[PDB]
Every structure is written in structure tokens, then in C-alpha cells.
Design a protein around this ligand. Sequence first.
Ligand SMILES: *[C@@H]1O[C@H](CO)[C@@H](O[C@@H]2O[C@H](CO)[C@@H](O[C@@H]3O[C@H](CO)[C@@H](O)[C@H](O)[C@@H]3O)[C@H](O)[C@H]2NC(C)=O)[C@H](O)[C@H]1NC(C)=O
Ligand SMILES: *[C@@H]1O[C@H](CO)[C@@H](O[C@@H]2O[C@H](CO)[C@@H](O[C@@H]3O[C@H](CO)[C@@H](O)[C@H](O)[C@@H]3O)[C@H](O)[C@H]2NC(C)=O)[C@H](O)[C@H]1NC(C)=O
Ligand SMILES: *[C@@H]1O[C@H](CO[C@H]2O[C@@H](C)[C@@H](O)[C@@H](O)[C@@H]2O)[C@@H](O[C@@H]2O[C@H](CO)[C@@H](O)[C@H](O)[C@H]2NC(C)=O)[C@H](O)[C@H]1NC(C)=O
Ligand SMILES: *[C@@H]1O[C@H](CO)[C@@H](O[C@@H]2O[C@H](CO)[C@@H](O)[C@H](O)[C@H]2NC(C)=O)[C@H](O)[C@H]1NC(C)=O
Ligand SMILES: *[C@@H]1O[C@H](CO)[C@@H](O[C@@H]2O[C@H](CO)[C@@H](O)[C@H](O)[C@H]2NC(C)=O)[C@H](O)[C@H]1NC(C)=O
Ligand SMILES: *[C@@H]1O[C@H](CO)[C@@H](O[C@@H]2O[C@H](CO)[C@@H](O)[C@H](O)[C@H]2NC(C)=O)[C@H](O)[C@H]1NC(C)=O
Ligand SMILES: *[C@@H]1O[C@H](CO)[C@@H](O[C@@H]2O[C@H](CO)[C@@H](O)[C@H](O)[C@H]2NC(C)=O)[C@H](O)[C@H]1NC(C)=O
Ligand SMILES: *[C@@H]1O[C@H](CO)[C@@H](O[C@@H]2O[C@H](CO)[C@@H](O)[C@H](O)[C@H]2NC(C)=O)[C@H](O)[C@H]1NC(C)=O
Ligand SMILES: *[C@@H]1O[C@H](CO)[C@@H](O[C@@H]2O[C@H](CO)[C@@H](O)[C@H](O)[C@H]2NC(C)=O)[C@H](O)[C@H]1NC(C)=O
Ligand SMILES: *[C@@H]1O[C@H](CO[C@H]2O[C@@H](C)[C@@H](O)[C@@H](O)[C@@H]2O)[C@@H](O)[C@H](O)[C@H]1NC(C)=O
Ligand SMILES: *[C@@H]1O[C@H](CO)[C@@H](O)[C@H](O)[C@H]1NC(C)=O
Ligand SMILES: *[C@@H]1O[C@H](CO)[C@@H](O)[C@H](O)[C@H]1NC(C)=O
Ligand SMILES: *[C@@H]1O[C@H](CO)[C@@H](O)[C@H](O)[C@H]1NC(C)=O
Ligand SMILES: *[C@@H]1O[C@H](CO)[C@@H](O)[C@H](O)[C@H]1NC(C)=O
Lengths: 729, 729
Amino acid sequence: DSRKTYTLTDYLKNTYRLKLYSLRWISDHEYLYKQENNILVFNAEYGNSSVFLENSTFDEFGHSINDYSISPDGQFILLEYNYVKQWRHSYTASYDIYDLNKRQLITEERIPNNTQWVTWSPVGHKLAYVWNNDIYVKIEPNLPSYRITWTGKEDIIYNGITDWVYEEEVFSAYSALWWSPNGTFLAYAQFNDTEVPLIEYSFYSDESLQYPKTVRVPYPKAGAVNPTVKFFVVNTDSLSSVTNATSIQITAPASMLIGDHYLCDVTWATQERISLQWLRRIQNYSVMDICDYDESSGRWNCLVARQHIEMSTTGWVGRFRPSEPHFTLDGNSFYKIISNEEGYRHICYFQIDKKDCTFITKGTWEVIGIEALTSDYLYYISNEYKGMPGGRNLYKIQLSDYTKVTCLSCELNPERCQYYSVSFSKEAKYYQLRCSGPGLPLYTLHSSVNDKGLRVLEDNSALDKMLQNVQMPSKKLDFIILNETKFWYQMILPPHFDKSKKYPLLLDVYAGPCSQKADTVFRLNWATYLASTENIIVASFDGRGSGYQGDKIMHAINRRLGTFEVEDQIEAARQFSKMGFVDNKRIAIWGWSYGGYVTSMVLGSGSGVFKCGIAVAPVSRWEYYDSVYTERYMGLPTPEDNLDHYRNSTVMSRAENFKQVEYLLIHGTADDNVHFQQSAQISKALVDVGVDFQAMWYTDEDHGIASSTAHQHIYTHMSHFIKQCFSLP
Amino acid sequence: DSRKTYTLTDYLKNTYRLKLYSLRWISDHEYLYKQENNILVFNAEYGNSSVFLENSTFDEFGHSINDYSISPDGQFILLEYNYVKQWRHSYTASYDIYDLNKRQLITEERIPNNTQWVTWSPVGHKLAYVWNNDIYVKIEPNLPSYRITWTGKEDIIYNGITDWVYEEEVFSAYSALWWSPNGTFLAYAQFNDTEVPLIEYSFYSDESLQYPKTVRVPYPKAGAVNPTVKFFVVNTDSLSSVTNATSIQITAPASMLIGDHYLCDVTWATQERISLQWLRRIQNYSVMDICDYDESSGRWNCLVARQHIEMSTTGWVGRFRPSEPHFTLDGNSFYKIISNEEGYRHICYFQIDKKDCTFITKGTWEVIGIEALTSDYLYYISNEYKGMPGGRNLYKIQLSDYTKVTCLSCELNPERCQYYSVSFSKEAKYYQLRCSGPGLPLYTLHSSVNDKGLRVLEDNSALDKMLQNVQMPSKKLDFIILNETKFWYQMILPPHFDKSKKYPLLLDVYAGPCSQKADTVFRLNWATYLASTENIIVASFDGRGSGYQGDKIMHAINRRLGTFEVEDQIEAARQFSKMGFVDNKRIAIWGWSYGGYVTSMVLGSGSGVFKCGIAVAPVSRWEYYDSVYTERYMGLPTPEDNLDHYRNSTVMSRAENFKQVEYLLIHGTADDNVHFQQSAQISKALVDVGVDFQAMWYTDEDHGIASSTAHQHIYTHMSHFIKQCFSLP
Ligand SMILES: *[C@@H]1O[C@H](CO)[C@@H](O[C@@H]2O[C@H](CO)[C@@H](O[C@@H]3O[C@H](CO)[C@@H](O)[C@H](O)[C@@H]3O)[C@H](O)[C@H]2NC(C)=O)[C@H](O)[C@H]1NC(C)=O
Ligand SMILES: *[C@@H]1O[C@H](CO)[C@@H](O[C@@H]2O[C@H](CO)[C@@H](O[C@@H]3O[C@H](CO)[C@@H](O)[C@H](O)[C@@H]3O)[C@H](O)[C@H]2NC(C)=O)[C@H](O)[C@H]1NC(C)=O
Ligand SMILES: *[C@@H]1O[C@H](CO[C@H]2O[C@@H](C)[C@@H](O)[C@@H](O)[C@@H]2O)[C@@H](O[C@@H]2O[C@H](CO)[C@@H](O)[C@H](O)[C@H]2NC(C)=O)[C@H](O)[C@H]1NC(C)=O
Ligand SMILES: *[C@@H]1O[C@H](CO)[C@@H](O[C@@H]2O[C@H](CO)[C@@H](O)[C@H](O)[C@H]2NC(C)=O)[C@H](O)[C@H]1NC(C)=O
Ligand SMILES: *[C@@H]1O[C@H](CO)[C@@H](O[C@@H]2O[C@H](CO)[C@@H](O)[C@H](O)[C@H]2NC(C)=O)[C@H](O)[C@H]1NC(C)=O
Ligand SMILES: *[C@@H]1O[C@H](CO)[C@@H](O[C@@H]2O[C@H](CO)[C@@H](O)[C@H](O)[C@H]2NC(C)=O)[C@H](O)[C@H]1NC(C)=O
Ligand SMILES: *[C@@H]1O[C@H](CO)[C@@H](O[C@@H]2O[C@H](CO)[C@@H](O)[C@H](O)[C@H]2NC(C)=O)[C@H](O)[C@H]1NC(C)=O
Ligand SMILES: *[C@@H]1O[C@H](CO)[C@@H](O[C@@H]2O[C@H](CO)[C@@H](O)[C@H](O)[C@H]2NC(C)=O)[C@H](O)[C@H]1NC(C)=O
Ligand SMILES: *[C@@H]1O[C@H](CO)[C@@H](O[C@@H]2O[C@H](CO)[C@@H](O)[C@H](O)[C@H]2NC(C)=O)[C@H](O)[C@H]1NC(C)=O
Ligand SMILES: *[C@@H]1O[C@H](CO[C@H]2O[C@@H](C)[C@@H](O)[C@@H](O)[C@@H]2O)[C@@H](O)[C@H](O)[C@H]1NC(C)=O
Ligand SMILES: *[C@@H]1O[C@H](CO)[C@@H](O)[C@H](O)[C@H]1NC(C)=O
Ligand SMILES: *[C@@H]1O[C@H](CO)[C@@H](O)[C@H](O)[C@H]1NC(C)=O
Ligand SMILES: *[C@@H]1O[C@H](CO)[C@@H](O)[C@H](O)[C@H]1NC(C)=O
Ligand SMILES: *[C@@H]1O[C@H](CO)[C@@H](O)[C@H](O)[C@H]1NC(C)=O
């Protein structure tokens, strides 16, 4: 075989590039798609298109446009520019609105620079935005804004946007604004961080900055004072009739008000009914209130007969938070993913004023998400097919007959396609299927009326042809049985893999709660190079604490992070050794974030199994990580609750055992998420017991170490380290 | 040779210890000396002693005593405890006073906790102390304090103590208090840092600390707003319990008041006469005022006829600051080191009211310091002997006939002893000589009247016996000639050095202005180990910019840091690499502080001479370092002054040239001096150009990286790096 291999430069320079097909539904039968910087509009039924916005239109706009957003009535387009990233989801930007009918930029009453969030109403062309921590509404794009809040205050009061911890750990979004279905009402949350402590770190900036800047962020570490939250609804239709429209507060239930709590979900049911879910700071008790607008009082009332409790005796509520409800059109019932009596997550059907629900799916597999609901069908993704917890398919269940469940994707291309996601048009008339592996991604379009495939949108035939000239690695997905339970693993195997040889092995770890590192997804990544060019097996194992296999497995680490999930990676490496194609003297481990924590715990365990390892941006002590994530699994770090385990589960306490291994510790100095502090404390502990190790800081990089140069630098540095460890030239 | 070598553990565990003999003169004929934690008093003439304080005296004291200070009259001892270090010289502590006559600890009116500086008067037993940035005076140890100042304010107003930059770069001390010779008057400086910007950096502390602390220090970087200064004198004999004390201000001369300036020296001449030197912010102009008490007005007057101006056309004034004057007994004349008309620093004799001084020494060598003055002789250290700028000897010059100069140390033991310092008794009746090399240190006592050698105090004979058992390296000191000028170097050569073999070579560099790395001092350090155990030659070179050889050499880098001193280290290595016994494939370079900057500039030069190097806490860009040191050499970073060269002399601009060398970059995170920022910007520049390198941070370590565990860890890490570079096992 004289074909080239997949090299590090190939990875770092994106030589072999996956094509996507990212579309945006603007209706029940049209979508937008960018082609040669032109935005085209496509007809789903026939596949013909036209130019929606010529790629030259904003030549002489004077700025580079980052993104765009069409009003639901298609009368306007919002153009985003001057984009400046903040955390994982947050950023600020400038906005212009372009009038499509008269084909002209609107120059009057512009959205201000440094706007934090903007969203159209779901119907028409109203806008809500947040600027300097207060909410503003525009009824018409060219006309003046109406201010909604006056309490906004940098780092203290957040209206309509989340603070750091709610952005990262509860909403996975910066926005905390929710328009009603037809745009009459605007709901929002207000966060108060007044007594929340600040994480402080230096940012060095360009070489020209003489004094470093101190970045200061309200961030509650485990056990600290959390932000408090209030919820409001305003009637935007009243805005042009009164000077100052009233924001009506909906208070949390008494069972939440007795102590610390969170708002964790907001979902509109009808034009005059909203559901809110609340969670206790001890995250095993959740309450949903269903609240109706009282026209005679202008108030929002939440009948106790409509309140729904969710709790767990074995762990926390939800995979990472309570699931979202999907209401029927009349808003009198809803479907929601709930853990059943056997501990498997399945779809339950609720009437709003009845406490007991009815499970409509069951079995020893789980529903991943509900994707669409019509009058006749519910569409969901699950890992049922072939009992592979790491596969994903789309299913359809008849609402009048639950025995009628159809798999829409399972058999389309079963060899190539075992991991799907879906994108439905506005009334679920069409759907795009996206297949992520195990073969090359395939994107296809389907009609819901007959479930027939309309056409292939992207098939990655260009890449298929390129990769034919490369010695690519293969991937095995399989399981081992421990204590009568199947635990799944994957291996990236070198080309021409030969079972009678002994290969070096790298264990690639994450292993946080509900994680999944063994799956059917196709990836071109660092492991690809390591296997293809360096003949290293790269393996991953999903042990106790891992997700999508029921609560018996997921809740095994409840109140006990740093125990079974760590031990199970060690045992996985033992089991791989027993398979006979692994060089016992050359087994390494690596991970990022939680995977950095686990790597570090494994390297400090004294097991003798691992020669070396690499931790990137590790957690080292749970008291240094945020409250919402940490306490979900660990409870509170007090003598009365779980302080003893918090104190027993640190990396630093294992420092002496690092004498036995080669370690490389890496961290970005501007990491707002897992603070540089965490690695600073690992290194001090290692120095204090006289252990030699290797280190690398990345100036001004955050948790993703994702700038183009730093990305290339880190993988280059790590490659040298691994190769040296394994005596590879 | 079956003998052991000098190993890394020997260096780190201090297995081979130099003995010292630290005495404190308390009169013209007695000194104090600590023996077995007893404090003994010695008669200089006969060498008999008595116990002054038993080591058992404070057995039940209840705190460990950090240090002590006996009052000049022997009646009290000040006991220092609860020591907490601040910067290079600053610290706070608690103090108790023990009355030696009544053998009792004083319990009334005690010195407060967290005291910043304490000092006895020079005669008797008055005390002055600074607490909460204000000055207090006690006339008797058991009596209440008189508060002298009321303006003290943390980080803003400093009375009687220095701020960060005056401590490090001006006074080399935290105290800004100066008692008059008999204690009548107490002079002091006040610093005002109102508009000085703060450097901010994180401090992580013990693992128990949930949130990192931000340390904030008023520190003026090059070109930034500097502290301002005022000077005052108070009469301690006329203090009142009923009224606040009156401090008299002495203002700076008008030629200083015109712009930014510094107070740089304070020296009392008589009981009623004080000298002050001031320095312009452009540090090539200095003025001395001589001020006399006026008993009828109670004020201090400085006659313009007694003003003495000092300026430099080629550089800055003084080696690092204007030199201190040495007044005669009547205070009508003084001696001071000044650069002569050929640029060599020699002793000049001034009359207080005459502009012209008379040089009393001359030659192509320099006076290092003035050590004592009597009516007949002035005693000084110089590098005259054998024309060796890296040796030091004690001389006396007859004040009535300047042709009569006598070397007092040169011939005592010329083979062992070529580097001396001295400590004279109160009226120069006796002196202690301290020989530091090139043989083992030797401490001897002498009488001035006929320069008799009275006795050997400590000869290090025990260490000599031990060292005969180990294969110690040798040291060569010699010179190369670069266009017509001798430049000196030293090499630490392996045991059994064979000039027909080719050894690897490490260049140990500092090379700051007025530095000297080639000398006759005996050292037991990391180089000792590298030569003795690893057979590496460790060389050092003093090129342009170096000290003690005249201003033509020292001022060669005026306004041009990072040019000639860098070029000259490359040239030295180029020359060493041709000498016959050097392996030109294995030459390395390392340095700390200024030496880290030079190392980094050398590695970024593109010379091709060096395989690898190590930079510890380097300067990387002059705009990041403090105003007083930086501007002394570089002027101000403005377009009108020297900005272009500030911008041309960074490490970051040379990043691309690091592609052909191996570099290790090390910095402590709590470096208040050369901020971690400076290395953070180097790393980012190398990442940006795609250059791989090695790094190590030291959490919570400062510029010295001097904690016991961090010290051992750094030298261990550097040793592994150099051995790898040189292919040494
Ligand atoms: C965000 O939450 C903070 C509390 O964490 C609220 O701050 C508190 O506001 C109350 C009422 O305005 C303050 O009480 C007042 O104190 C003053 C004395 O200074 C007294 O004159 C008043 O009669 C009353 O007692 C309280 O000082 C303040 N507490 C803190 C810790 O700042 C704040 O109002 C919340 N903001 C919003 C928009 O919800
Ligand atoms: C330490 O130095 C600071 C900085 O120069 C001194 O503060 C300054 O003090 C003067 C005199 O009080 C202030 O002058 C005032 O100016 C304002 C204009 O803002 C004017 O309204 C008044 O007529 C007055 O003249 C000046 O503002 C002030 N600057 C500051 C604090 O930023 C301070 O007095 C010095 N402290 C000591 C103890 O020497
Ligand atoms: C050191 O000893 C001196 C006396 O020592 C005598 O020892 C002889 C061997 C010889 O060298 C002789 O010349 C020398 O004098 C102590 O001196 C004494 O000091 C006290 C003062 O408190 C007086 O009472 C004595 O008169 C005086 N003797 C003389 C004439 O000097 C001295 O105190 C002692 N010093 C120490 C620190 O122990
Ligand atoms: C709109 O109404 C709100 C709520 O009443 C007003 O905000 C209050 O303003 C007063 C006076 O400044 C404060 O004391 C209250 O604390 C405010 N409450 C809130 C909820 O912010 C707001 O000022 C009104 N704006 C206008 C234009 O009248
Ligand atoms: C969007 O829904 C809202 C709420 O139901 C509608 O506003 C109500 O309209 C009804 C008329 O059927 C009236 O009884 C009320 O006066 C309105 N109530 C409120 C809360 O304002 C609104 O008209 C709907 N919009 C559209 C376009 O149908
Ligand atoms: C939510 O979790 C907490 C913490 O585990 C539970 O509180 C425990 O309650 C048990 C039984 O009532 C007590 O014996 C313990 O003292 C509590 N745990 C500790 C050690 O803090 C609570 O019961 C859980 N709630 C649900 C719904 O199961
Ligand atoms: C000694 O001088 C200080 C001058 O400040 C006096 O102390 C202050 O008096 C002022 C009144 O002008 C108060 O506002 C302060 O609180 C006082 N002290 C401090 C801590 O600043 C003091 O009274 C003077 N004593 C005499 C005898 O004159
Ligand atoms: C310390 O020196 C001071 C200053 O010369 C002496 O104080 C003077 O002494 C005479 C007494 O003979 C008085 O007439 C003067 O008024 C004093 N001057 C001042 C400024 O007070 C003093 O004698 C010396 N003190 C000691 C300890 O000897
Ligand atoms: C102190 O140094 C400054 C800076 O080098 C000197 O100022 C320069 O002097 C020359 C000659 O007059 C001028 O041509 C330059 O333009 C001056 N300014 C600068 C910023 O370079 C000053 O002359 C020096 N003083 C002494 C005593 O020599
Ligand atoms: C897409 O084309 C539509 C034209 O309708 C006919 O197209 C023929 C090719 C055939 O498939 C017939 O069945 C169709 O009736 C037109 O109406 C749409 O406006 C076009 N859409 C876009 C976005 O270009
Ligand atoms: C602009 O659009 C046209 C589509 O016909 C295409 O030829 C051209 O390459 C596009 N340019 C950009 C900016 O990609
Ligand atoms: C946004 O900032 C730009 C650049 O300074 C300015 O010209 C423009 O007027 C600003 N836009 C708004 C809405 O204020
Ligand atoms: C204390 O002092 C005695 C007196 O000579 C000395 O010999 C002894 O060894 C010392 N030991 C201590 C307590 O340091
Ligand atoms: C110093 O602090 C200790 C402990 O609080 C206290 O007992 C002592 O009195 C303090 N000393 C003085 C002189 O203030």
C-alpha cells in the first residue's frame, strides 16, 4: 500500500473537508440556503430555486456581515455585524434592518451598537432586544423603541438575558426572552447577581496594552451565594396606548420559595397560557406551573390543580435539567420525556389538570428528544434500533393508536447511516434528514404526507473520492460485559490493523455524567491522524455515570464524582490489554475538561496501567467549579450534606502518585469556565511533593483553546508528547 | 578517579556549606556575634568574649523570634516575630522589647502588630516605627508613642516607608527614615501614589481558598505617571503630649521642581546639617542641596552657593543612581565617587561651597566604594590590582599626600584571595576583611593603626577537607579582544579538563547595564554541578554595557537596550566555538531577569550559534517594566524621545527566528517585579507564528522562584532540558 496517510497537517489544515447542507425553513415549504455567498430560496416540493439576496447586494455596505435573520412575514431582514464573542452563546453586535419590498436599508431609529440579543416576534415583524441589560421592543422596524425595564445594571441586574451560570448550565443560551405564539405577550426572566462572588483573572490583550486588564465575572462556585430570579409577562399590544406597560410577575410556588431555587424552563402553551418549570437548588425536586391570563384582572393565575411535580429518589431531575413539554394545539395536554419505573426515559402524556400521566413508549432504550407534534403524529429520535445506545433514528407514533410506531430512518441506508437528526418545516410538512455516520454524512429531503424521499441534498461524493487515495483508519463499536451489564466502547484502528501485533493505545476520555463517547458518528480529527499515520489505537469507553442507557447506569455516580467513572476507565484499559493486540507498556490517557479531571484522577490512582497522559483544562477540585453543575451531582459542600466527598475527590490529594507517570498539563489563561486556578493548584501540589511534569499555558485562550493558531499549536505540542512517550520517531 | 562529583542533590540539599562570620560592630572596639543562638560580645584587640544574651532567655516567649536588634546603648533588645515578607526588602512583623538591665519584657505601650518598619536611634534608645503608613516615635520603650504623621493611607500616602518602585529601584530598602547622628532629629520622605496605575495579578493561595485573590500594587511602567515625593525633618527632643508635632519641609531645588523628579540620596553631614540629592526623571541631571538648621527660626535653609550639580553627556548619572557623599567630621568638605574626564569612576574631594572638586585617584580602573574616612586616611575598595576588573581589594590613600596609596589586601594571600569587602569599627580603629575568592572564603580581623593582622575569624578549613573528596570543577578568568578593547570572560571547566576533547558549552548570561558576570568569586551553584557531574563548560562574558571598566564600555548601550549587549554575547560564543575544546553543535544559553531578555533576544537573532536556551522571568518589552530602571537607560517611550527603539527591541518581534532553536520559557505567576505578562506575551507571539517551545509556570512564586520546593523543581526541570539538548544521560 503506497497511498499517503492522513497526516497531522491534513487535520490542522482542513485538507479533507466535510460538506454540510445547512438550510433555514422560512415556511412550511420553502427554505433558505447560501450558495456562492448568494442566499437562494428553495421550493421543498420540486427543488427549484431563485435568488433571494444577490451576493453583491451588500457590497458598499462598508462592513462584513456575520449573519442575517428574516422576519417571519418575510418583509424584513436583520443583518448582524461587528460581532464580538462573549461566553459560549453570548456575544454583542451591531444590527441594520433591510426592507426587502422596497429594497433599502432602514436608516432611522436603528438598533443601538453593543446590543446583547435581538429577536423577531414569531409572527409578523415586531422586535425585542436587550441593550445595557434592559429590554426594548419595536413594533415597526423604522419607528422608535419602547423601553420595558429600567433596572438593568452591568454585572448585577440582567433583564431578558442570562448571567454566566444560567447561560452555561441552565438555558444553554444567552436569551431569556420568550414571545407568545402570535406575539401579543413577551415573557422574560430577570436575574439578580448582587451577592454572587466574582471570579477575577488577567487578560493581556495585544502586545500594545501596557497594563493587563482584570476580567471580573459573577460566578457562583459550589456552595456559594447564587443569583436569584424573577419572572414577568408584558402585553406588547398595550405599548402604543400607555406610556409605560406593566410587567406582571408570576411568582414561584411556595414549595420553591422556602429556599434557593432556579427557573429552568419556559414554554408557551397557547396565546394565553404559559408553563414554567422550577427546580430546587437541591436538584431532585422540580415543579411545573401552568398559568392563564385573566382578562378581567390582567393577571396571570397558576391553578394548583394544574401543577405537576417531578422528583428523583436516586439522582437529579432530567439528563441535565427537567425536559421541555410539547403541548397539543388546544393547550389542554402535553407530552414530555420522563424516567419510567425501570429508570428508562420515555414519552409520557399528561392532561394539564391531572397528576398521573400515561407512558406512550417503553422498553430498555431511551427517547432522546421529541422533534415535532401534529394533530395525528408525534415524531421523536431514540436509540431503540438494534439496541445500540450510540445510534440515533427518527420515529413516528400514531396518537390515536400507540401500537403504530414507524421507524422513518432505520433502513434508508443501514450500512452507511445509523446516527440521524432531523429538521422539520414550519408545520411539519417536510423534513431534512441528517445522517452523521458511520459512513460519510448524507443529507436528504422528505415529504411528511407520504414519507417519501424527495432528493439527496448532499452526499459527500467529492470527499469520498479524495479519501479513496488515503490510508484511512477504521472504527469498531462494541461492548464488554461487567457484572452482568453491557458497557460500550469504540476503537479507532490503524489501516491494515493486524490482531497478532501489539499496538500502543491512547484512551480518549470524557466520562462526565450522561456522557457518551462510544457512538456511530463519522469524525475526521486528531485520533484519525494518530491511528492513520502513527499506528496508535485510540479508544473510548462509556462506564458508570454515562448516558442514554437508563438511570441504573447514569445515577451510579450520584453524590460520588471521581469514583466509579474513574475506576471504570482503568478497568477498560485492563480489558483492552486482555484482548491481545495492545502493548501493555505503551498505554496512555487524555482528556479535556471533565475528561481532564478523569485523566488526572486516573494518573494519580497508582494503578500502574498508564505510562503517561495529558489533561487539558481539567477540573481539579469540585469546590472550584460552578454551583449549578457541581451541586446537581454532589449536593452541597457542608458537613451536614456532602463536604467529606468534595474533600476526598480532588486531584491535588493524589500528587505523590504522579511520580509513577509522565504528565502534561495544559490550560488557557482566559478560561472563564474551568478557571486557570484549577490547574494552578494541581501544579503547586506537584511541585510541593517534588514531581516533575510538563506544562503549557495558552495566553488569552478560553475553555475551547480554539483560535486558529492556538488550536494548531496545542495539537502539535500534544503530538510530540505522545510520540515521545511511545518512542515513535 | 573514584571520588564522587558535585551532584544536583548536593546543590539542592546544601550538602557542602560555606561558613560565614557575620559580626555587628557596637563601638570602636567591640562587636556582637551569634554563636550557638547565644549572642556573644567580643573585644577586638584580644579576642576574648562574654555572653551578652543566653539562648535560653526566651524559652517561654511563646513565638519564634525572627530577628533581633539591640539598642546602641546595650540596654534594650527588640525582638521581631510574626514576620510576613512583602517585596525584596519590605515586610511586616510584631515586636516586643526586653529590658536588659531589669531582665524583663516590657508590657506597656507596646509596638503594635503589623508594624512596617522599626529602627532605634543611632545613639541611646529612642525608637521610630511606621504602622498603617504613619510615623511614630517613642523616647523610652515603656512610654506612649508620639504620632508624627496623620496622612498615611494604604496604597496612596506613604510616610517614612517607600512605595514599590522607590523600594526596588531607588533606595534598595523599605525605610524612608533617617535619624540625625545623635538622634535629635528624624528626617523622612513622604510618597504620594494617587495617580500611579496598579498592576493586578491573581494569587491562588492554599487549596482551601475557593476564589483567587487579586493583588493590586501601584507600579509605574515606562512612561506612566510616577509617584511624587516630599521631604521633612522633625525635632524629637521637643515633642508634646498636648499638641501635634511640627515637621519642617525641605523643598527640592527649582531646577527639579520644573518637572518630574526623584529624591535619590539622604546623608546627614553633622548634628545640624543634612545633604539631599535629587534626580530629574531624565536621569542625566542630578542636584545636591546641603541644608543647615537655623535655631532662631527653627527652619532648614539650603544655600544656593552650597548646591552641587552632577550631569552626564554620554549616559545617566551614577552606576545605578548618584553616589553617596562621605563628609568629614566638621562637615565642611566631602568625598564622593564621580566619573572623571576619561569616563572612569574615581574619588573626588569637594568643599561644601565650591563648584570644582579635585580627583584624588586616577587611572584606567575604578573605585567601587568608599568604606571609611578619618582625618588622615580614606579607605576604599577598587579593581586596580593587576588590571583585573573582576577583582576587588582594600586600599588607603593619605589625605595629606595623594601619591601615597597603600594596598591593604593585595598581598595577604594573592593565590586564594582576590575579591574582598570590608567592615570597619565605629571610628575605623579595626576592620574585618572578607575574602570571597577565588579560593574558599576567609574572614580576618585587623587593626588600622599599623594594619596588623590580629586573627583568623573563619577559614573554611572544614569545607576544604570535605571538598578534597569530590571532583570539583576549575574556573578560568581571561579576556578576548574586540576591536582594540579587552572584554573579560570566565569558564567553569569540568574536572580533568582535556583541551583535546570537545565539550558542550552553556552560556550563563545576565548582561544588564553595569553587570559583571566574570569575576574571581568562589561559588557553589548550578554551574558547579553542570561542570562537575555533566561535563559541560559554563561560560560567562562581560561585553558592552558591562560595569567597572569605564563609561566608554558601560554607556555603549545608552538609549539602545537590546543591541550591543546581545550582539556581544553572540560574538563571545562564536569565539568560544572556535577555541578547540568546544563542540560547536552543542552550545546553549540561559539567564534570569535581564538575562532572560538577553537569552531570548539571542535566540531570536537568527545567528545559528545556539542549539537551545532557557529564559527565566524575562523582560520581553521595555514598556512593561518599571519607569525608574527602564527610563534610566531608554529615556521615555514617546515619538519625541525614544519610542522607535522601545518598539524595535522586543522579544515578540523576533518570534519567527525561534523556529530553529529549542526554547524553555519559565515564569512565576505572582512576580510583582517582571510581571508574568511579559512571558505571556512571548508565548502568544510564538503561538502566532507556529513555533513549538516548552514552558513552565510556578504558581504563587515571585521573581526569585525561591520557595524551597519551587527552587528544587525549577533546577530539576532545567537540568533535564539541558541534558536532553546535549544528548546527555
Ligand atoms: C437585587 O437583590 C438585592 C439583594 O441582594 C437587593 O438589594 C437590596 O435592596 C433593598 C431594598 O432596596 C435594600 O434595603 C434597604 O436598605 C437601606 C439601607 O441601606 C434602607 O434604607 C432601606 O429601608 C432598605 O432596608 C438593601 O440595602 C439591598 N441589599 C443589598 C445586599 O444590596 C436589590 O434591590 C435587588 N434588585 C432588584 C432590581 O431586584
Ligand atoms: C497626593 O497627590 C494627589 C494628586 O495630586 C493630591 O490630590 C489632589 O489634591 C488637590 C488639592 O486638594 C486637588 O485640587 C482640587 O482640584 C479640584 C478639581 O477637581 C478643585 O475643585 C479644587 O479647587 C482643588 O484645587 C486635586 O483634585 C487632587 N487630585 C486628586 C485627589 O485626584 C493629594 O492632595 C496628595 N495628597 C497629599 C496628602 O499630599
Ligand atoms: C576582655 O578582657 C579584658 C581584660 O583582658 C585582659 O586579658 C589579659 C590576658 C591581657 O590580654 C590583658 O591585657 C587584658 O586586659 C576585659 O577588660 C576589662 O574591662 C572592664 C570594663 O568593664 C574593666 O573592669 C577592666 O579594667 C578591663 N581590663 C582592662 C585593663 O582592659 C574586657 O571586659 C573583656 N571583654 C569582653 C567582651 O569580655
Ligand atoms: C415604568 O414603570 C416602572 C415600574 O413602576 C418604573 O420603575 C420604577 O421607577 C421608580 C422611580 O425611578 C423606582 O423607585 C422603582 O424601583 C422602579 N421599579 C422598577 C420595577 O424598575 C419606571 O421608572 C417607569 N418608567 C417610566 C418612563 O415612567
Ligand atoms: C393573539 O392572541 C391574543 C390573545 O388571545 C389576542 O388578543 C386577544 O384577542 C381577543 C379577540 O379574540 C380579545 O378578546 C382580547 O381583547 C385580546 N386579549 C389580549 C390579551 O390582548 C390577539 O388578538 C391575537 N392576535 C391575532 C393576530 O389573532
Ligand atoms: C433530595 O436529595 C437529598 C440529599 O440526598 C435528600 O435528603 C436526604 O433525605 C434522606 C431521607 O429523607 C435523609 O436521611 C438524609 O439526611 C438526606 N440526605 C443528605 C445526607 O443530605 C432528599 O430526600 C432527596 N429528595 C428526594 C425526592 O428523594
Ligand atoms: C493632631 O492632628 C490631627 C489632624 O488631622 C487631628 O486629628 C483629626 O482631627 C480631625 C478634626 O479636624 C478629625 O476629623 C479626625 O478624625 C482626627 N484624626 C484622624 C484619625 O484623622 C488631632 O485632633 C490633632 N490633635 C491635636 C492635639 O491637635
Ligand atoms: C545632639 O545634637 C544637637 C544639635 O546640635 C544638640 O542640641 C543642641 O544642644 C545645645 C546644648 O548645648 C542647645 O543649646 C541647642 O539649642 C541644641 N540644638 C537643638 C537643635 O536642639 C545636642 O546637644 C546633641 N544631643 C546629644 C544627645 O548630645
Ligand atoms: C539628557 O538626555 C537627553 C536625552 O538624550 C538630552 O536631550 C537631547 O539633547 C540633544 C542636545 O541638546 C538634543 O538635540 C535632543 O533633541 C535632546 N532631546 C532628546 C529627547 O533626545 C539632554 O541633552 C541630556 N542632558 C545632558 C546633561 O547631557
Ligand atoms: C418553483 O417552480 C414553480 C413552478 O411550478 C412548476 O414547476 C415545474 C418544474 C413542475 O415541477 C410543476 O409541477 C410545477 O407546478 C414556481 O411556482 C415556484 O415559484 C418556484 N419556486 C422558486 C422558489 O423558485
Ligand atoms: C457572487 O455570486 C455569483 C453567483 O452567480 C458568483 O459568480 C460569485 O462567485 C459570487 N461571489 C462571491 C462573493 O462568492
Ligand atoms: C455604531 O457605531 C458606528 C461607528 O462609530 C457609528 O458610526 C454608528 O453611527 C453607530 N450606530 C448607531 C446605531 O449608533
Ligand atoms: C545554647 O547555649 C549553650 C551555652 O553555651 C550552648 O552551648 C548550647 O549548645 C545552645 N543550645 C541551643 C539551645 O541552641
Ligand atoms: C497582637 O495581636 C495579638 C493577638 O490578637 C494580641 O494578643 C496582642 O495584644 C497584639 N499586640 C499588640 C501590641 O497590639
